[PDB]
Design an enzyme around this catalytic site. Structure first.
Site, PDB file in Angstrom:
ATOM      1  N   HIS A 118       6.640  53.238  81.299  1.00  0.00           N
ATOM      2  CA  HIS A 118       7.403  52.429  81.922  1.00  0.00           C
ATOM      3  C   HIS A 118       8.272  52.828  83.054  1.00  0.00           C
ATOM      4  O   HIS A 118       8.480  51.887  83.716  1.00  0.00           O
ATOM      5  CB  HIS A 118       8.566  52.354  81.195  1.00  0.00           C
ATOM      6  N   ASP A 177      -2.992  41.591  73.086  1.00  0.00           N
ATOM      7  CA  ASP A 177      -2.882  42.171  72.470  1.00  0.00           C
ATOM      8  C   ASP A 177      -3.150  41.724  70.869  1.00  0.00           C
ATOM      9  O   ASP A 177      -5.177  42.457  69.773  1.00  0.00           O
ATOM     10  CB  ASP A 177      -1.532  43.054  72.564  1.00  0.00           C
ATOM     11  N   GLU A 213     -13.662  66.757  58.448  1.00  0.00           N
ATOM     12  CA  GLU A 213     -13.953  64.861  58.747  1.00  0.00           C
ATOM     13  C   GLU A 213     -14.497  64.838  60.040  1.00  0.00           C
ATOM     14  O   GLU A 213     -13.954  65.518  61.356  1.00  0.00           O
ATOM     15  CB  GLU A 213     -12.220  64.137  58.957  1.00  0.00           C
TER      16      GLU A 213
END
Ligand SMILES: CCCCCCCC/C=C\CCCCCCCC(=O)OC[C@H](COP(=O)(O)OCCN)OC(=O)CCCCCCC/C=C\CCCCCCCC
Ligand SMILES: CCCCCCCC/C=C\CCCCCCCC(=O)OC[C@H](COP(=O)(O)OCCN)OC(=O)CCCCCCC/C=C\CCCCCCCC
Ligand code: HEM
Ligand code: HEM
Ligand code: HEM
Ligand code: HEM
Ligand code: HEM
Ligand code: HEM
Ligand SMILES: CCCCCCCCO[C@@H]1O[C@H](CO)[C@@H](O)[C@H](O)[C@H]1O
Ligand SMILES: CCCCCCCCO[C@@H]1O[C@H](CO)[C@@H](O)[C@H](O)[C@H]1O
Ligand code: FES
Lengths: 78, 241, 379, 147, 379, 241, 78
Positions: C201, C228, C271
């Site tokens: 921001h 979104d 993983e």
């Protein structure tokens, strides 16, 4: 940074219509679909290549590994 | 040699994304588990209670737990004692402890089948192939004392002797108990035993797919709607020159 | 004040971050991942918390507490699934999030980018220590092999691992601290995620054509909120399809066997979202260097901002580096593959090659094709 | 103050009393006569202590080191000749080798067939190395402490 | 900018909250508790986290996991002590923090005060569900009696408690969710604690003479940082003396017996910092009203700001209400006493009397002596 | 009647804030626990290992654990078997389970003494008084079959018969084993057994007190120092009139 | 709110000395201790009372409860 102090703009006139006076997903053919293609055929030749390449190597690799396991008819002809 | 044979792939009645388990077959399987496997294989996570409403009636299942007695908590004098199993007891363990079992099955240890179907690559396709698949070892290859050649099993030597031949048991629903056939039901059982959700999880998957179907287009039209004010917009530059 | 939405100490925070917030108009769909990443987090923390409420962290109860949660806890099965699969939705997104930034030079916003690297590191750790919890063969063996790695660190090495986990080997005293760590870190992620958006921001949000957006911004809410939420569903549908139809599609079966220290599985691998590095790890033989390669495979991200040479920010109008970029993802994609495979001939080579082509494209090609690309524009 | 509090907390992380307790092991050599292989529990894994006879000893010391996958001189692996101290875990896939068995009169791991000699050296099977030898020393003629 | 400490997005946050922050000069020592409360929190979360790393949340391992932590985990004993005793340091402070505000009318800063009430409620809950963890007789019985209270809530009652905890009675399924809850809430406290200070900072900080401080403020750091650190030690020394010399001074021995559902201890009572309300709870016979009295004993704090009548903020120059105030603390102090005692004659009376004198001093006297006090000043 | 008698208060050698436990006495106590109490009272949280370095030598303690055999893990055939206890074993349990013990001590259940000293109001003062304190019930009061009057115990009827009289054992350090005396050591033991930290926790308390002593005055002087600029300050109002 | 916009102040002149040119804890007797007392004797009569009162009630209560337990020599003179 907020609204009202972004840039020194001058002489631009814009025209837009309420969302209710127009169409949402307009001209799917007139202009819609064409550009989608105007795009697939614009990067395919830039993205596809290294992916295609990857593939070949994946295959080569798996195939070779899967061959180096099987026996050679001649490791023993006696 | 890290050389292995991989199971084929059977069209199980429950492989469809929207197709549930064939409970009539599950019911059967239970029987082959109970009447043949359960003498070596433990199934610690399932209990009679589960059969209720899925492939057995409450009373039906209640009476099926009775058939087995279980060891239960201290006396009034503090000692272990037996008694007819209830609905809440879990399937009996064939052996008091692993080493105890390894010694009853010549060294090897029969795994607990609770999640077997998902503990091995292939799942039912695997287990099935394994069960209906023993045969004499190929030339040059010799299996040692106590082990049995099975191509589908890594190493091709299983401590498990072919556990299933024709008959061996008699499906009471009135079904041609051929090895091949009996092994099928046992597998569809193992499936259920490993993920009882199955049917529920899929009916759910259906309902989700229909929501996505309906929800995204709406928000898509909505997104498209608000934006239009820009997509359609029109600039113009007019310096007074 | 009038608005009473721009005066209140708290609403003013919201009306300045999800409304009235100046966002460029031409923002691409690639920008939908920060959003997702955030909601991805809310989701984990939720499902997790709700899942932790049925877990026991003890060698003798772990594996079954999870199992019980699935067989006994109402809708327990669904919750576990969402949480597990969610972990992946999380990484897939975080990886597309990195990407977008790497090729729109979003990284030029250093501070907002550096924290992002810290987010990735953190999100990893929390996901490594979190997979042990179910305590299955891979949970255990993965923990034992990956943790023991520090052992290479000379001198103050063994003593670290040997303290890291319980005492002498991944056993109860580490499942606990792992569980704890797992419970804690996610909240730290959220914490930092705030700092991330703060720094962001500070400047506007970058955009695809990489040129000043001030020319015409648009109120976030009226638009991007909708944008979104659309992305949320478009990406959440596959998540669920996967989560509800092939729950184990991405999960090792070997992790359905209660952990047993007397049976090391063959092919011990972390993983998928870790593989690419697992690869670059076993690329260099000298155990020590291996860790370094591993460490550098991610930490290199901190250097990206110092390897930017183009007189242009994004690489929309940079066809050369554009192929370099895709040639790179393809490269990571390959490393992933190589990682899931054994350490044998066809692979071992392709491995260290790809691994080498990784550090060159980032360290040497990119910056070079960068300047060379500038000369061609008469600069 | 800080130096303390910080280090104090940095230990409430380190291994606890109950663990360090099973850290080291005392073994009486005299209760394990020549010829037999004894199994003990140490750090949750089996610890092998075998008393060797002429047959076991000598047959093991004569073969060449550069001929092995894990080149190791047994006498460069031992403190006392009548004593063998091994980690009861095969270097192949974490399994447990068997006493008084195999093609080499030492130990044999039945999981995938790794054969070891009376020196604990790898001879047959994919096992990458010889059985591991724990950090240790002797306490007396009949006492030994590993750890 | 020059300073580079007032320009940076993050430092600027600090240099505006612990430095350069305008604080009145005449701030009293009573203002040292916000500080303490905060560091009190950092401390708990630390010791707790570090303590959670050795705990097991299961009916069969809880009690001993704690015991083991004390007998086996290095410096484990100290950590537990600090955490337990810390809970109290925490409440003693939060109670002096309330006080100061109640009598300097700090509460007139509504928003910053309302969140504070939420802080108290939260800090409680986290401390109720946290005491069960050790699973001793009181842990268990306290949980069973206090939780079952909701049972009075007509209709949707039993079903709440019956869901709140496990299934049918405080048993394993609730120790878990309690442990989880305990781990979560503290972080929520910290979260909110930020909002608290935000709202605060909106206005200045109030002061003893209750009149505008603008006349002359002073940079927090140079001064108050020192001031608070002084307070930190002056208050932390007794904490430790207590924690290190009479560790159990404030702890029920009955909670050294592993929980046993077949032996209800006599005199089941929650921790001291809850007593005052436990009292006002058993003051009114009708079980329902009892809960309400209990609920109102704390929730009344939300009403305080609407019961302020004095033309003056603090009550420095308000001798009448000044005695009313002390007459009040004394009252709470008495309720505490009454709560630790059995429900028998000498007490039962003193109980409902004190309990009644509680709601009157807040609801009716204070506001009344308030206006009357104004007339006397010719207003 | 909720009427009760409260223990007095003895000057234990370890009540000083800076005074630790008298280990020579602890050592003794251990003996009376081992030779007399341990036949009914379990002490699950302490183990021989702890004695080492506190009131017993390593070897000394090693040999003391040998005296007892313990039940240990499955065979190679899977069964429980016995063996001489090691240094890591915890003090033996007299009974296999509670109900088992309740039946050996006429209904009542001898509590585990691990934390007794802190599980009862009074601690050692209590336990002591209780031990050396049985006597015939006062008039009008009658205790039932199997119980023994003891004023110090709530209800005045304990399932525990006076467990300690003169001698009963012989302190080997060479100490006049009188009931009163022997009970003292047992108590100082129970203390240690409940909070082994004790001595450590106090030496620590000392060091903390000295830091507070030194640290606060410094920061006090420091606080006073910075502030002075205000405390001393001087205002003045000067309107030009 | 920051520094530089708190209030409209005018005509106040203040004088202060560096911390090093003066004494930290000065005149403990000249002015120090007196005021401490100037205070204890200023509120004692406002704070003490309700506390003292509390005490009495605490005592009364405990004593009474502890009396209602003991037997009355005459609940049975037969
Ligand atoms: C590490 C783990 C890696 C493996 C994860 C696997 C995910 C698999 C990749 C799928 C990629 C889908 C790409 C579809 C692309 C469509 C497209 O070709 O066009 C490209 C396109 C449009 O071009 P413009 O010039 O802006 O158009 C002008 C404006 N109208 O934009 C695309 O950038 C942004 C692409 C992001 C790529 C996704 C790659 C994610 C992985 C890389 C992360 C790397 C960083 C280093 C280490 C990771 C830790
Ligand atoms: C609920 C649990 C309650 C029990 C907790 C126990 C804590 C015991 C109380 C100890 C009190 C110590 C007080 C020392 C007081 C010294 C003093 O008499 O003077 C009073 C004094 C000075 O007067 P000034 O006019 O400002 O001076 C002019 C400026 N120079 O200032 C004192 O306010 C502030 C006192 C705060 C009182 C502490 C009370 C804490 C308990 C009340 C909380 C109540 C709210 C309602 C419910 C609780 C939930
Ligand atoms: C009953 C029809 C039955 C089933 C079903 C079954 C399955 C089964 C599987 C899937 C395995 C695991 C294979 C693997 O390790 O990948 C397995 C293994 C063993 N079994 Fe079995 N088995 C069934 C029945 C029986 C019966 C009746 C016995 C005991 C007499 C038995 C025993 C074993 C043993 C031993 C193993 C060997 C494991 C090894 O590593 O060799 N099984 N079984
Ligand atoms: C050995 C000298 C010894 C001690 C010490 C001891 C202590 C002890 C305590 C403190 C209690 C608890 C009292 C309470 O409940 O508040 C207690 C209780 C019982 N004991 Fe004991 N005891 C010692 C020795 C023995 C011996 C040798 C036996 C068994 C023959 C024994 C038994 C019991 C029993 C039974 C109880 C009664 C508990 C009840 O509720 O009645 N004790 N002991
Ligand atoms: C879980 C952690 C993360 C979350 C929730 C998160 C969230 C966000 C959010 C809300 C945005 C705004 C929308 C957008 O531009 O995409 C954002 C922007 C950004 N994030 Fe992240 N981020 C995360 C991780 C990262 C990582 C790993 C990096 C760094 C490698 C990163 C780099 C950036 C940058 C540069 C921007 C985009 C600026 C632009 O191009 O406009 N973020 N992130
Ligand atoms: C940052 C978000 C999180 C990530 C990336 C994450 C990831 C994971 C992973 C990888 C697993 C393993 C799933 C499996 O067994 O296959 C897991 C398990 C677990 N996580 Fe998380 N987790 C997150 C947050 C949480 C939080 C905050 C909680 C709750 C406070 C939580 C509690 C657990 C528990 C109890 C398990 C064990 C149960 C199970 O594995 O099914 N998780 N998490
Ligand atoms: C754990 C939670 C809490 C923490 C850490 C906390 C923290 C603080 C802090 C840092 C201050 C500044 C210094 C001071 O004025 O004392 C503060 C102020 C304040 N807090 Fe809290 N607080 C907590 C709970 C509460 C509670 C329960 C109330 C409400 C009943 C409350 C009411 C206030 C108010 C009114 C101010 C003081 C304004 C003034 O008089 O200058 N706080 N608090
Ligand atoms: C808000 C600060 C906290 C408060 C008010 C608090 C209070 C308490 C209380 C009352 C106890 C009981 C002590 C006893 O047994 O006598 C306790 C225990 C416990 N707390 Fe906290 N706690 C806090 C934060 C934490 C946190 C965040 C953790 C770690 C993540 C934690 C973990 C535990 C654990 C594991 C216990 C059990 C061990 C023990 O009781 O000794 N606590 N806490
Ligand atoms: C984002 C889109 C979400 C889709 C809604 C999820 C639907 C879950 O619906 C579930 O269906 C099951 C099968 O009938 C029922 O047994 C469950 O009670 C019900 O909750
Ligand atoms: C804020 C004041 C903190 C005071 C410092 C704490 C001192 C703790 O000191 C401790 O003393 C013990 C007794 O000798 C030692 O055994 C410990 O190792 C040591 O850390
Ligand atoms: S695991 Fe050791 S030889 Fe197979």
């Amino acid at each position: 940074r907020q609204f009202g102090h972004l840039t020194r703009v001058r002489h631009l006139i814009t025209y837009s219509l309420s969302p209710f006076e127009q169409r949402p997903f307009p001209h799917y053919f007139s202009k819609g679909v064409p550009n989608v293609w105007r795009r697939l055929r614009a990067c395919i030749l830039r993205v596809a290549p290294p992916f295609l390449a990857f593939y070949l190597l994946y295959t080569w690799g798996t195939q070779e590994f899967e061959k180096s396991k099987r026996k050679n008819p001649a490791a023993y002809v006696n | 040699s890290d050389l292995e044979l991989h199971p084929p792939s059977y069209p199980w009645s429950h492989r469809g994304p929207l197709s549930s388990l064939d409970h009539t077959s599950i019911r059967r399987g239970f029987q082959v588990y109970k009447q043949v496997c359960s003498s070596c294989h433990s199934m610690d996570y399932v209990a009679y209670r589960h059969l209720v409403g899925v492939c057995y009636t409450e009373d039906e299942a209640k009476a099926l737990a009775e058939e087995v007695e279980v060891q239960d908590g201290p006396n009034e004098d503090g000692e272990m004692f037996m008694r007819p199993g209830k609905l809440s007891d879990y399937f009996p363990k064939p052996y008091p402890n692993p080493e105890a079992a390894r010694a009853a099955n010549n060294g090897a240890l029969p795994p607990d089948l609770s999640y077997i179907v998902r503990a091995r690559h292939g799942g039912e396709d695997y287990v099935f192939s394994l069960l209906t698949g023993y045969c004499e070892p190929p030339t040059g290859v010799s299996v040692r004392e106590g082990l049995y050649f099975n191509p589908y099993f890594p190493g091709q030597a299983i401590g498990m002797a072919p556990p299933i031949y024709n008959d061996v048991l008699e499906f009471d629903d009135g079904t041609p108990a051929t090895m091949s056939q009996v092994a099928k039901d046992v597998c569809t059982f193992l499936r259920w035993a490993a993920e009882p959700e199955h049917d529920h999880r899929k009916r759910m998957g259906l309902k989700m797919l229909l929501m996505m179907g309906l929800l995204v287009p709406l928000v898509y039209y909505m997104k498209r709607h608000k934006w239009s004010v820009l997509k359609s917009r029109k600039l113009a530059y007019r310096p007074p020159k | 004040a009038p608005n009473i939405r721009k005066s209140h100490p708290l609403l003013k925070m919201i009306n300045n971050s999800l409304i009235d917030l100046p966002a460029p108009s031409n923002i691409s769909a690639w920008w939908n991942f920060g959003s997702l990443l955030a909601v991805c987090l809310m989701t984990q923390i939720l499902t997790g918390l709700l899942l932790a409420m049925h877990y026991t962290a003890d060698t003798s109860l772990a594996f079954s507490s999870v199992a019980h949660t699935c067989r006994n806890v109402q809708y327990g099965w669904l919750i576990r699934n969402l949480h597990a699969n969610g972990a992946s939705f999380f990484f897939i997104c975080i990886f597309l999030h990195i990407g977008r930034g790497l090729y729109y030079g979003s990284y030029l916003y250093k501070e907002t980018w550096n924290t992002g690297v810290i987010l990735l590191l953190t999100l990893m750790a929390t996901a490594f220590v979190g997979y042990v919890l179910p305590w299955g063969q891979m949970s255990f063996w993965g923990a034992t092999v990956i943790t023991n790695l520090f052992s290479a660190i000379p001198y103050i090495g063994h003593t670290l691992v040997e303290w890291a986990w319980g005492g002498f080997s991944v056993d109860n005293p580490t499942l606990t601290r792992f569980f704890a760590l797992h419970f804690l870190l996610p909240f730290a992620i959220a914490g930092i995620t705030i700092i991330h958006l703060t720094f962001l921001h500070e400047s506007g949000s970058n955009n695809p054509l990489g040129i000043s957006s001030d020319s015409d911004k648009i109120p976030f809410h009226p638009y991007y909120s909708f944008k979104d939420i659309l992305g949320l569903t478009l990406m959440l549908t596959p998540f669920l399809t996967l989560a509800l139809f092939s729950p184990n599609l991405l999960g090792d079966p070997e992790n359905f066997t209660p952990a047993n220290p007397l049976v090391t599985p063959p092919h011990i691998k972390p993983e998928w979202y870790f593989l690419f590095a697992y690869a670059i790890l076993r690329s260099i033989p000298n155990k020590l260097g291996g860790v370094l390669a591993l460490a550098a495979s991610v930490l290199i991200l901190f250097l990206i901002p110092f390897l930017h040479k183009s007189k242009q920010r994004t690489m929309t109008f940079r066809p050369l580096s554009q192929t370099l970029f895709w040639l790179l993802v393809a490269n990571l994609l390959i490393l992933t593959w190589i990682g899931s495979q054994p350490v044998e001939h066809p692979f071992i080579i392709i491995g260290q090659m790809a691994s080498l082509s990784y550090f060159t494209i980032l360290l040497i090609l990119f910056p070079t094709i960068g300047t060379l690309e500038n000369k061609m524009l008469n600069y | 103050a800080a130096k303390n509090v910080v280090t104090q907390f940095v230990s409430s992380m380190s291994a606890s009393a109950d663990v360090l307790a099973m850290s080291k092991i005392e073994i009486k050599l005299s209760d394990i006569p020549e010829g037999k292989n004894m199994a003990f529990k140490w750090r949750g894994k089996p610890l092998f202590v075998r008393h060797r006879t002429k047959k076991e000893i000598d047959q093991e010391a004569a073969v060449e080191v550069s001929q092995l996958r894990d080149p190791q001189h047994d006498l460069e692996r031992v403190k006392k000749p009548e004593w063998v101290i091994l980690i009861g875990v095969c270097t192949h896939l974490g399994c447990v080798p068997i006493a008084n068995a195999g093609d080499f009169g030492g130990y044999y791991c039945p999981c995938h067939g790794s054969h070891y000699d009376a020196s604990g050296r790898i001879r047959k099977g994919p096992a990458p190395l010889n059985l591991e030898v724990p950090s240790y020393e002797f306490t007396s003629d009949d006492m030994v402490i590993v750890g």
